Amino acid sequence: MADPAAGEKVFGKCKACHKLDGNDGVGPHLNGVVGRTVAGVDGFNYSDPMKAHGGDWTPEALQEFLTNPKAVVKGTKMAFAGLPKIEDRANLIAYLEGQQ
Numbered sequence: 354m355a356d357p358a359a360g361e362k363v364f365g366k367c368k369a370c371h372k373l374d375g376n377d378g379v380g381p382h383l384n385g386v387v388g389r390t391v392a393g394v395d396g397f398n399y400s401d402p403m404k405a406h407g408g409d410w411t412p413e414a415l416q417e418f419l420t421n422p423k424a425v426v427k428g429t430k431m432a433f434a435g436l437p438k439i440e441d442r443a444n445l446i447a448y449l450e451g452q453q
């Protein structure tokens with residue numbers, strides 16, 4: 354299931370650290386992350402294994418990192434446990450395509 358309205362309720366788990374619309378808080382601003390370069394917001398300083406990772410945030414790279422972030426990038430400052438169900442990750446990735 355890839356629904357952007359159910360992805361807005363799943364993004365309430367992200368809202369306290371991350372704000373979509375230009376504003377960088379505890380994490381960076383997430384407007385248009387689907388396809389965006391790893392360590393790409395010039396303005397937010399990232400972790401050293403996040404800067405050394407490379408490539409882009411594709412829908413499989415976002416599904417692996419949102420399943421467990423500190424197992425995928427060993428030494429990221431993202432203090433989030435994980436989304437185990439596919440519908441929560443796929444609904445959220447449809448909302449992050451909706452806000453490009």
Ligand code: HEC
Nearest residue numbers: 366367370379380381391392399400403429430431432433
């Ligand atoms: C605060 C406790 C966070 C929560 C809750 C979530 N994330 Fe976060 N995110 C946070 C930080 C501090 C960072 C930077 C990590 C680093 O190593 O520098 C991040 C990063 C992401 C990223 C990468 C973005 C990029 O521009 O490279 C993504 C894709 C990301 N976080 C997504 C995300 C989502 C969708 C969350 C809710 C399910 C989520 N984060 C929660 C801090 C926190």
